[PDB]
Paper text:
The RAD9–[name]–[name] (9–1–1) clamp forms one half of the DNA damage checkpoint system that signals the presence of substantial regions of single-stranded DNA arising from replication fork collapse or resection of DNA double strand breaks. Full catalytic activation of ATR at sites of [name] is dependent on the RAD9–[name]–[name] (9–1–1) heterotrimeric checkpoint clamp preferentially loaded at a 5′-recessed margin by a specialised form of the heteropentameric AAA+ Replication Factor C ([name]) clamp loader in which the large RFC1 subunit, required for loading the homotrimeric PCNA, is replaced by the smaller [name] (14,15). The presence of the 9–1–1 clamp loaded at a 5′-recessed [name]–[name] junction, is communicated to ATR localised on RPA-bound [name], by the scaffold protein TOPBP1 (16–18), whose BRCT1 domain binds to a phosphorylated motif in the extended C-terminal tail of RAD9 (19–25), and whose AAD-domain binds to and catalytically activates ATR.
Here, we have determined the cryoEM structure of the human [name]–[name]–[name]–[name]–[name] ([name]–[name]) clamp loader complex bound to the closed 9–1–1 checkpoint clamp and engaged with a [name]–[name] junction. While some fusions completely disrupted assembly, fusion of [name] to the C-terminus of [name] significantly stabilised the overall complex, and delivered material in which all subunits co-purified, which co-migrated with a [name]–[name] junction in electrophoretic mobility assays, and that showed the presence of both clamp and clamp loader in negative stained electron micrographs (data not shown). For cryoEM, the purified samples were mixed with ATPγS and a DNA molecule that folds back on itself to give 24 base-pairs of fully complementary [name] capped with a tetraloop at one end, and with a 24 nucleotide 3′ overhang at the other. The structure of 9–1–1 in the complex with [name]–[name] is essentially identical to the crystal structure of the isolated clamp, corresponding to a ‘closed’ conformation which closely matches that recently determined for the equivalent yeast complex. The other major interface between the clamp and clamp loader is provided by the [name] and RAD9 subunits. This is the most substantial contact between the two complexes and is mediated by the interaction of a linear segment of [name]—an α-helix 194–205 and the following strand to 212—which bind into two distinct connected pockets close to the junction of the two halves of RAD9. The core of the interaction is provided by Tyr206 of [name] plugging into a pocket in RAD9 lined by the side chains of Ser46, Glu165, Cys218, Ala263 and Leu265, and the peptide backbone of Phe217 and Thr264, and by Leu209 and Met211 of [name], which together fill a pocket in RAD9 lined by Val41, Arg45, Ala47, Tyr48, Leu132, Gln133, Ala134, Val135, Val261 and Ala263, positioned in the equivalent position to the PIP box binding pocket in PCNA.
Numbering used by the authors:
A (entry chain G): 20 to 336
B (entry chain E): 4 to 118, 127 to 349
C (entry chain D): 38 to 361
D (entry chain F): 35 to 349
E (entry chain B): 15 to 274
F (entry chain K): 287 to 346, 386 to 549, 555 to 590
The structure:
Amino acid sequence: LPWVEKYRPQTLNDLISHQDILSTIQKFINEDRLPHLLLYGPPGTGKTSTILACAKQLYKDKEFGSMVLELNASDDRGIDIIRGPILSFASTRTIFKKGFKLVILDEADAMTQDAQNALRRVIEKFTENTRFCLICNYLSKIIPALQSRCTRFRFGPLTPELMVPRLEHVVEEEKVDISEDGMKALVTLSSGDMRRALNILQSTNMAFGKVTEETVYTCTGHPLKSDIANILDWMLNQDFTTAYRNITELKTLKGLALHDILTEIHLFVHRVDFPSSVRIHLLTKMADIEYRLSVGTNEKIQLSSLIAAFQVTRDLI
Amino acid sequence: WVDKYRPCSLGRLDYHKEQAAQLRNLVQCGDFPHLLVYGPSGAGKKTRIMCILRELYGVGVEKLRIEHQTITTPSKKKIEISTIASNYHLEVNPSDAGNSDRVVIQEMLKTVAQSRDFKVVLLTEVDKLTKDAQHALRRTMEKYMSTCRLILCCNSTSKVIPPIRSRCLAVRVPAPSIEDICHVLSTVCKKEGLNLPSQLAHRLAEKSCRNLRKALLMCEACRVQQYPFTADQEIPETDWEVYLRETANAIVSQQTPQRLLEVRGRLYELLTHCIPPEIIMKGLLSELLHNCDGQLKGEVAQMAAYYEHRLQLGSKAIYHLEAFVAKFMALYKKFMED
Amino acid sequence: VPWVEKYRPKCVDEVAFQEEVVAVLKKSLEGADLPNLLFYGPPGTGKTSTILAAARELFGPELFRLRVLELNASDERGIQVVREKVKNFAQLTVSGSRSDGKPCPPFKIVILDEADSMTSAAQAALRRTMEKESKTTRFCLICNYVSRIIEPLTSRCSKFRFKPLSDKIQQQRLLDIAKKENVKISDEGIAYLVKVSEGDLRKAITFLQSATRLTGGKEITEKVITDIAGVIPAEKIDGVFAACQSGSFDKLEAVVKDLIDEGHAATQLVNQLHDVVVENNLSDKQKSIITEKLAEVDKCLADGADEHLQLISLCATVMQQLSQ
Amino acid sequence: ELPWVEKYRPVKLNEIVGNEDTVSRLEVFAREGNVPNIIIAGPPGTGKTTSILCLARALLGPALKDAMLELNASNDRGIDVVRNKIKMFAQQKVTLPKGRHKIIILDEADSMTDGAQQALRRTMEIYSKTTRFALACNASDKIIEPIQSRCAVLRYTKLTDAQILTRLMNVIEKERVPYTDDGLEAIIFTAQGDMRQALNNLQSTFSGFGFINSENVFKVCDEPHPLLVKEMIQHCVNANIDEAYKILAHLWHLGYSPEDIIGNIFRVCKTFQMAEYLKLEFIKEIGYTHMKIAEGVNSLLQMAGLLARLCQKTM
Amino acid sequence: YSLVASLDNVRNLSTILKAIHFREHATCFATKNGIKVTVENAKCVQANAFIQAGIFQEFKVQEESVTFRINLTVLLDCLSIFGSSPMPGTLTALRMCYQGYGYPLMLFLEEGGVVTVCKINTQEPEETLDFDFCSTNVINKIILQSEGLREAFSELDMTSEVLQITMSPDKPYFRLSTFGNAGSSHLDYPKDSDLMEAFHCNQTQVNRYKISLLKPSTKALVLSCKVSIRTDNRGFLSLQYMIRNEDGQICFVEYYCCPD
Amino acid sequence: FNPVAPTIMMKFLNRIVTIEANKNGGKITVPDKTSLELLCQGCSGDIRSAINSLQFSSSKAIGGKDVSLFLFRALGKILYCKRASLTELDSPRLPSHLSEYERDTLLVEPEEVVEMSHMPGDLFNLYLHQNYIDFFMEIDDIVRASEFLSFADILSGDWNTRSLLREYSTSIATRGVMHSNKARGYAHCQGGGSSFRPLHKPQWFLINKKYRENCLAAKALFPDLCLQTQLLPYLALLTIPMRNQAQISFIQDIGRLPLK
DNA sequence: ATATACGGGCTGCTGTTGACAA
DNA sequence: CCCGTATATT
Ligand SMILES: Nc1ncnc2c1ncn2[C@@H]1O[C@H](COP(=O)(O)OP(=O)(O)OP(O)(O)=S)[C@@H](O)[C@H]1O
Ligand SMILES: Nc1ncnc2c1ncn2[C@@H]1O[C@H](COP(=O)(O)OP(=O)(O)OP(O)(O)=S)[C@@H](O)[C@H]1O
Ligand SMILES: Nc1ncnc2c1ncn2[C@@H]1O[C@H](COP(=O)(O)OP(=O)(O)OP(O)(O)=S)[C@@H](O)[C@H]1O
Ligand SMILES: Nc1ncnc2c1ncn2[C@@H]1O[C@H](COP(=O)(O)OP(=O)(O)OP(O)(O)=S)[C@@H](O)[C@H]1O
């Protein structure tokens, strides 16, 4: 169950987007020149999946438990529990006489400085019986000494064009009826994270039965593009009280949050023509508004203040 | 308080009788929600809570069983905390432990929850608590709402986070006006010889603000200084007020760095004698605003609010007090020469 | 037992609002493929109740010891407990069936509330825990603010926002409860009470109980609800603007001093002032400035500042604007 | 076998293409054989450890196994066992022909505690007639003053383009890899001083492409970050918010977390050519924004507001 | 109730468990033939035991095998709760019941009218390696006594880091070397002695081993009467012991270690 | 003791190099004189490193011992603001309206000075707050400096992120105190003053410790912070005797502050 | 007429991991 | 950092 981990890729050819990196990794595997990797990027891109597919391709099914170590954030990572076990692991003469060993180090940005220094020594000392692989999200929490010996690979955010066919395959696999606007709205409401495009589908399909733009927007609660355009039109032209009443009624009818409205208004403000200074004023006030909505205040007053900050500067000009 | 002429029954209350009848109607049937009492200090919330407990139970609330308890932090550290908790009702003040209040609340509340058919657990001064302690208290008071009820007491219901505020009723107690204070002072003194003329009682009530505790203390203090009262007899004041008055007088007579250092040392000495920074700021504002008469008055008020927010956000008081003093001095110097 | 604990939803067909989540839970009950859950929203909408009802009617009251654990904010959570205890529970195996022969789901449920009060170090272990063990355990996180949770924790859970309740639904539920408990309500009193409650089920239920126990079982009007809630009278609130419009600083200070003497919370005063401001005959610029000042004062009060000085600042800014 | 970063290691002392003075002096000292204790410092990726090991091998020769001691950070360096073993090795007598002495090397000595160093400083001034020391480190502020007070401190520097190009040409000639001038310039640009990084990048590019054209180098991944922020700060100097936001949007779409960007902004801002008032205000705004981001509220709007506040200062 | 087991001499099980106790956790294996407790460390060293059904008097199992993980220290403390020094004539009896998955392990002990009851909740399982050492690729094998190496392995705990084992048909038949702070220390053992029951080495083999992994063999060497050493082509070391009880039965303990 | 004077080290180094030169043996380049004072300049009165560097350099600057800056010297360096006469360069200027913020060129890096003193930032800021008043002549600059110090204080008030961002506070405080001094910062305007004045130590430590001990002495002894804020005003207006001996002294302690 | 040393101001105010002496 | 003073030496 739980589609996201039910349809996880099991081979290197069932991924998308990044193609040069995958071909380079395949060439590394073919010539048996696998270096130490430092895979980093934003959430939901396919790092652990890629490394696990590489591990399953390299080794047999009965050897994965005796020649592969896995250390994560839920395990213990100090000094002694690394100085003993991994030094002994590199002190192990290889069983099955084939290949080398692997130590997967997930969430590598959690260890301390001493552990990283010892790991630098471990990885540099003996590059014939172990091949470390670090996977991180922040590159500021890795010491430069350990950052200068592992091949850095960047996994950027995904793009809709190659993101569509995998969702189409998932839809076809089960019995789901899909539309055109539904796919576009489903893909758009995910900033490159594929896991936020596969879980929304499961949540929506199990509540209504069919997927459409209105269906997904009601399942999640995101405001529509036309709604944001109407709000902006009401802001830029009409009076104070009339705009307040209109947006109040619109928000009361369909319960809408304030974060998404702020994000869409920010994008539309940057997309329209303004004489510099007004844009600076709007950006500053809207950033303050967004910051102030994480303490426990009231949303109505924040909406009124957003209206007030947007109104006067454009009304005078 | 004086604790010698305080009532112990919902009847014969000198003020705020209607809400007392409402509380009696609520307590006479059980089936209680959690209670949160708020209002200005000196209004007498503790008397209401104690009388509610007396009405809910029998007469077994008039005993004192002061108890000590030692608990342990996660590693080894020990916390000693004293409770006045007598039979049935349990009373605790988890503010004597600075950052051990969270574990105090957890352990003590979870022990007493398993230990009418229900008890109460008072939590005095809920204002000065961290954020995690309130979370744990809220969860444990929601979980076991079948054998124990909570009656929190505080003032300025703004520090308590909304989830607790939206989890219990809210009872408010306002200050007891002015005429009622003079009447209660007159009756309490007439019970014990001599009397208070109406003018003297009115002057004491006006000068003692809204706090009946302070008014009673001032009246008793004046009674031990002079037995025959007159129509032109003043009231003694504390030594932390005249000091602030002198500091405010000196902060405006001259504006030089040496005077700034002198007033900084004065603030140091005043802070040494256990006066919180907030009262210092309030008194300084009152004395300074006593004579501004202009836009500088509003500017000073806004800057003082800014500095107060800064003080309650930061961790060093003297920095902010000195900054406010310097800004006021500069503004007054600029205004004087124009 | 108070009315809040007596009318707690014991079944999925007792939650009023939130159609999508209840539909998803119903579909996943008589079937399979239930994903991870992440509930968030304002207080008094019902999040613990829904998951507790789902767990109760999926397993049964006699099968709670070895199927569900709840880790609240009173459990001393840290890295060690997440590393050992949660892993040990999640690494077990599904037990047998129940007494009454019914279909059963082959998974356990781990419930943890106030996950926003934890630390990042524990959250990393927690997020890695529920990937390799997605065969026998499902996780239901509950929070008020999503921002206090790291990205990989919220990137693998279905996010469900709980809307604040509507007028008609709250009115119907309150009428049902009042009919059940035999209390005489007025058609205008309920319409005022729902407005006062600002969209809170628990607050409205407590208000109803406190009103019916005070009155003893007679008709309750709006005047009782105003006294119980504590709404500031409009005649007093007009004086603030009357003094701020013209005069001097001393009268403004005296008015605010009396208002804070009476014990009213500053949040209610700000909320009521905001309604008056945006409906009067004032220019747009003055309204904008006053609204921004009100928002700033509200935030500063929410960050544990003083009450007298902030009210003085707001009133002084209003005095400056109204005399311009 | 091994990758290209650990297989092409110099075995002699004249293959090192780093600094020119210290290496020549070390060659002269190895010729003579009366070296004092030395402490080497410098940026990573130069070859300090290579120089130390080559010097020791040249000094000893065939008796290296039974007359050399090497200690690391993976190996336990407490106080008790380390002081015991050090004193065993110092007091033990060995025969060396004319002027060769016993060598004790402690790599990355900055990780030692104060107790270890304070116990070590006694053994390094008495047995000097039969043994000598040699230390390599990165941060030289960690070593206490008394230990430095009797050592020769040699400080390295980041490699320039000429030596990097010469050794890269040597490697290419050895491996017979068809090349192009602009591609090698791009590789050197990506290197940014460190040399093992450059060799690893070249090997990664050559893995599955067969050419070192610039397009292939950029396609196979990487790219240097700071020079983009350097232009962005200059753009915000002149109140050009419209031109300033473009680079921020590009970086955000590239996949960089807010903290990584905001740290580099501060680091580039400190070493810049501006006035004092502007520097003060910029530092203040960056500090407030970093506090906000660390508290959890991170998004594009906060960075846009920071840019707007930076541009407001100059009006 | 899955498996229930009763016995009247706890000392046999207690000493068998103590002969293998150097970790904190252990994994059990209940089968129609008996129990088998195994432990692993550093993904290289692995020690296993065996308690056949002949020892037991009341043994009952249900359906298939049963696996669970138990803390070893707590179990060993609970077993020997009546003092580890009984005079001849005093015995302790124990009963244990495990009622399937998800329920703890019972232990009722009795001696001379004193009855104790204890429970151990189990959170299982882990995964074990596949150290197959079938006697097909074994090249060097030897069998020998214990009193010879009592002091020898007792004189083996120094501040060294590697132990060298060399076996050859000629000259150093069985030599152990330890390089430490002071100097070398050789402990050559010749053939045709009172502790040389069979010498059948074929080709010379010199190998290095870690002291940390091979140290806990002292406990197995102390409570033993014979030791068998086996090494294959690659260089993996297999140690076989032979322990006896008061009644006069025999139980075996095996150790597997990998070379450097 | 005191560091060796330049002349003594100069004469001894000259004697040593003369002795080496007289050894002859071969045509070896004597180290140049111009580098010989450079060797002694970057050693700070330490013979052993000077001799080591001379040996290293005579093989055919080296010996860059790190400096410690003597914190009381760093404070003076920050608070004295050695300025230049605005040598003709292409530094950016404030275009039109910021004409009152023009400053002369600076020859000090505050970050290096603060780092090299080896002190925590929150202590450096306290010392600066204690010692920065006396060097100022105007009030507006004092106001600006106080505001900058307060803003530096705000950034470190939490506990989880107190050590993630600490350089910002110290940098802001140092640069604000340095730039706000417009009276001093006009190059050739330092004549004449800067008499023989010693610095001091912050007085906040004793006051804070007294506050804490008085907190405890108020709590545990009237426990049935708020007591010092609310109950202790009542204590200040209590002034009546009671039944004890060590408590009358405490009552007379708080309530007898000097006042005419 | 020029290089070098005295004089006066500093030890100080919640959690998770690691080394030392017994 | 800062100012003024007592001794070795050419
Ligand atoms: N590019 C992709 N190709 C294929 N499947 C993908 C891709 N991106 C995400 N997925 C799927 O989404 C699931 C969740 O993403 P993960 O790989 O677990 O995230 P991640 O890369 O590990 O980053 P973290 O764990 O948040 S640091 C994966 O198990 C895949 O099934
Ligand atoms: N109805 C009353 N009649 C006479 N005196 C009263 C009455 N109510 C209170 N008092 C007096 O008020 C004083 C006690 O004040 P309280 O109301 O108990 O202050 P409080 O409730 O403790 O407020 P906090 O929050 O604890 S500071 C005593 O002097 C009482 O005698
Ligand atoms: N959506 C709802 N449907 C029906 N009754 C509700 C709903 N929300 C609240 N209630 C009523 O209010 C009571 C309190 O609900 P809870 O589940 O405790 O609130 P909650 O989910 O804990 O939200 P908190 O506690 O403010 S974070 C329930 O027992 C119901 O009687
Ligand atoms: N000066 C140099 N000349 C030639 N190759 C060099 C030089 N410096 C570094 N290298 C290369 O760097 C590779 C490994 O670098 P190391 O010498 O191990 O780094 P390091 O000197 O130990 O400094 P660390 O350990 O990173 S702080 C060698 O295989 C060389 O190819």
